């Protein structure tokens, strides 16, 4: 239960409903102070609410990794229908937790900031500033390193 939730690696809703269902849903215990998981009366609703949560986690993880994803491809991933996925994205975008651009025609989802050619050049400028710092440092390690031939 902990492990799937903790990884930002892909999960699929369905696998989870069965996996958790056997082990976790049971929620046996002796204390009267907790027996809540899905065994209790509000517990039933809590499992219903879990569909929404899992699918939303899939959206966050995909937002970072992917920059552009095909629409078709994202619905499989989330475990949602074509209409549902496009719809679920707008609600999230207005609410502000991920930023997607939704084509209601099933075309593409862009988790990027709006592309400019200009944008890309700037990202390289920063990398360049780092790249120079690394090259100056490295030269030094070379001089000590050349001296030795007794440690090979």
């Amino acid at each position: 239960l902990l492990k799937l939730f903790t990884t930002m690696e892909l999960m699929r809703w369905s696998t989870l409903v069965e996996d958790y269902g056997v082990e976790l849903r049971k929620g046996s215990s002796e204390t009267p102070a907790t027996d809540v998981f899905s065994s209790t009366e509000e517990g039933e609703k809590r499992w219903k609410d879990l569909k929404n949560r899992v699918v939303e986690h899939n959206i966050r993880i995909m937002a970072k990794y992917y920059t552009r994803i095909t629409m078709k491809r994202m619905a499989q991933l989330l475990d949602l229908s074509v209409d549902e996925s496009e719809a679920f994205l707008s609600n999230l975008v207005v609410n502000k937790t991920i930023f997607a651009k939704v084509d209601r025609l099933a075309g593409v989802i862009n988790f990027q900031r709006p592309k400019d050619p200009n944008n890309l050049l700037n990202d390289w400028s920063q990398k360049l500033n780092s790249l120079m710092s690394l090259v100056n440092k490295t030269t030094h390690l070379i001089a000590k390193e050349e001296m030795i031939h007794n440690l090979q």
């Binding site: 719809a87 707008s90 975008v93 207005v94 651009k101 209601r104």
Partner: protein
């Protein structure tokens, strides 16, 4: 006095409600936004048309 007041109230409501549906950008279909916004098909087209200008 009443009419004017009601009118100002109408232009503001219309703008607030639109921002939520539109927000993904790109090519949202007039029809999907229409459903979410809580508007009719004929009304949404006209409201959007005024708004571009």
């Amino acid at each position: 006095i009443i009419s004017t007041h009601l009118a100002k109230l109408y232009d503001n409501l219309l703008e607030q409600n639109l921002i939520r549906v539109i927000e993904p950008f790109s090519r949202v279909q007039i029809e999907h936004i229409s459903s979410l916004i809580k508007l009719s098909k004929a009304d949404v087209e006209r409201k959007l048309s005024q708004m571009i200008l």
